[PDB]
């Protein structure tokens, strides 16, 4: 899973990045687990 609007769904090893536009959030992971 690439992006999500549920923080836990990404299973990021580090704190995810939060992108928020109107008042609604998206989370992305910049810490790739190879």
């Amino acid at each position, epitope marked *: 899973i690439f992006i999500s609007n549920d923080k836990e769904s990404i299973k990021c090893p580090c704190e995810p990045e939060r992108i928020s536009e109107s008042t609604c959030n998206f989370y992305v992971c*910049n*810490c790739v687990e190879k």
Partner: antibody
Framework: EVQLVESGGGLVKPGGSLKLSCAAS????????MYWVRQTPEKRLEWVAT????????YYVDSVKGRFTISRDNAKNNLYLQMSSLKSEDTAIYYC????????????????WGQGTLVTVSE | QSVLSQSPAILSASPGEKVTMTCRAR?????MHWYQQKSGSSPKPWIH???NLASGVPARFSGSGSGTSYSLTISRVEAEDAATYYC?????????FGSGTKLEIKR
């Protein structure tokens, strides 16, 4: 202001065990991942463990797998590090940390560090 | 895995001079962090995400780079800039720290 205050650091014999606390305040503890990072006597910096927020997801550095346990208590705003089967190599200052503020964050950096607590493993 | 080499280990500069220290990664990393450490205290976040200065860090500092080569520059070194600087990445897990560059000031 964000504050992280570690404690529990001490002398412990090889093979012994010990439990560090980190008392977090000035933010919503449960909104953030938490980390332990240590610095050895030679000053090398090493990530040791991560615990996610939401449902516990834990991660470890290999040299510590099966020996350390990171946990958190959102009721009490605390992070912990149960150590056991301690080795002289685990000797270091242990820092608890988290990502930075809302602009400076999301990119895998350690944005706040506590003042650290020293763990000596010796006879 | 994505291990970091920092060079040089020790850098001597006089006040006013420009220094650059550099941080190489074993394979491509996408963001690089830098900390400043003075003894008796813990690492202070200094540059986040390659090129962004942490609140309070003076404008003489900068970070750049991409791929497997990153760096930190001080356009004109000052006495108070004596410290050890460490790079850190987490583009690839587990996160890794370089072993530091110590900056000595000439006087």
């Amino acid at each position: 202001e964000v504050q992280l205050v570690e404690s529990g650091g001490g002398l412990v014999k090889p093979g012994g065990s010990l439990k560090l606390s980190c008392a977090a305040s000035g933010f919503i503890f449960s909104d953030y991942y938490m980390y332990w990072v240590r610095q050895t006597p030679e000053k090398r910096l090493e990530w040791v463990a991560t615990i996610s927020d939401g449902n516990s997801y834990t991660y470890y550095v290999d040299s510590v797998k099966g020996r350390f346990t990171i946990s958190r208590d959102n009721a009490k705003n605390n992070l912990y590090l149960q150590m056991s089967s301690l080795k002289s190599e685990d000797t270091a200052i242990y820092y608890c940390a988290r990502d930075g503020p809302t602009d400076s964050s999301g990119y895998g950096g350690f944005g706040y560090w506590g003042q650290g607590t020293l763990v000596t493993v010796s006879e | 895995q994505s291990v970091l080499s920092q060079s040089p280990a020790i850098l001597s500069a006089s006040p006013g001079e420009k220094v650059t220290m550099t941080c190489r990664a074993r394979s491509s990393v996408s963001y690089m962090h830098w900390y400043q450490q003075k003894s008796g205290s813990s690492p202070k976040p200094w540059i986040h995400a390659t090129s962004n200065l942490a609140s309070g860090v003076p404008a003489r500092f900068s970070g750049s780079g991409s791929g497997t080569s990153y760096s930190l520059t001080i356009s004109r070194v000052e006495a108070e800039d004596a410290a050890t600087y460490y790079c850190q990445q987490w583009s690839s897990h587990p996160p890794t720290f370089g072993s530091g560059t110590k900056l000595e000031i000439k006087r």
